Amino acid sequence: GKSDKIIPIAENKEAKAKYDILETYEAGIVLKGSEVKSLREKGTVSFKDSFVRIENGEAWLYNLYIAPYKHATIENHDPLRKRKLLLHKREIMRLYGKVQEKGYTIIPLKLYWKNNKVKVLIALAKGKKLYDR
């Protein structure tokens, strides 16, 4: 990684294995500027404690394993960091119904910011299937 100026973030794979991937959606996360730098320079985030849930009309990102450190004072909230990522209108509604009710789940994969903002990729997986072992 010499040229370019894109910084990679987030990562996963376990879900795919233990859970068969069916469909994938696209969400976009946009925050201030100072925040971006903190994470970009550092290079650490949730591992196996961050989940994604779809609500309202867009994809939502919830992390319960924030690695970064931006709290020096003793006046902060629980480590969650709720972020809202854009989405569609028809798709969001559809996925919510089938994926949720039928018997599916939503988890985060890899989100990186290029140019200046982050894009997160989400995938839908089921609680194992096909081969029952």
**In what side-by-side order are the strands of the sheet with 117-125?**
50-55, 58-63, 83-86, 21-29, 117-125, 105-114
Q: What angle do CA 14, 23, 96 make, to 5 degrees?
A: 105
Phi-psi label, residue 17: left if phi above 0, alpha if psi -120 to 50, beta otherwise: alpha
Domain limits at 87?
Answer: 1-133
Cα angle, residue 59 at apex, residues 129 and 67 outer, rounded to 5°: 85
- Between vectors from CA 48 to CA 74 and to CA 83, what angle results, nearest 5°? 55
User: Residue 6 belongs to a domain with what CATH number?
Assistant: 2.40.280.10
Helix, coil or strand: residue 93: helix
Which candidate, 6, 3, 35, places its Cα nearest to that of 113?
A: 6
| Structure determined by | NMR
- Contacts of residues 45-53 at CB distance under 8 Å and 24 or more positions apart, as own/partner, are 45/9, 45/10, 46/10, 46/108, 47/11, 48/14, 50/10, 50/108, 51/106, 51/107, 51/108, 52/106, 52/107, 52/108, 52/120, 52/122, 53/106
Neighbours of 55 (CB within 10 A): 10
**Which phi and psi (to 5°) does residue 105 adopt?**
-135, 160
Secondary structure (DSSP) of 5-63: --B------HHHHHS-EEEEEEEEE---SHHHHHHHHH----SSSEEEEEETTEEEEEE
Q: Give the total number of structural domains in the chain.
A: 1
Distance CA 5, CA 7 (A): 7
Residues 6+ apart with CB under 8 A from 91: 25
What contacts 126, CB < 8 A, 6 or more positions away? Answer: 19, 20, 22, 103, 104, 105
Please give the structure tokens belonging to residue 116. Answer: 């200046």
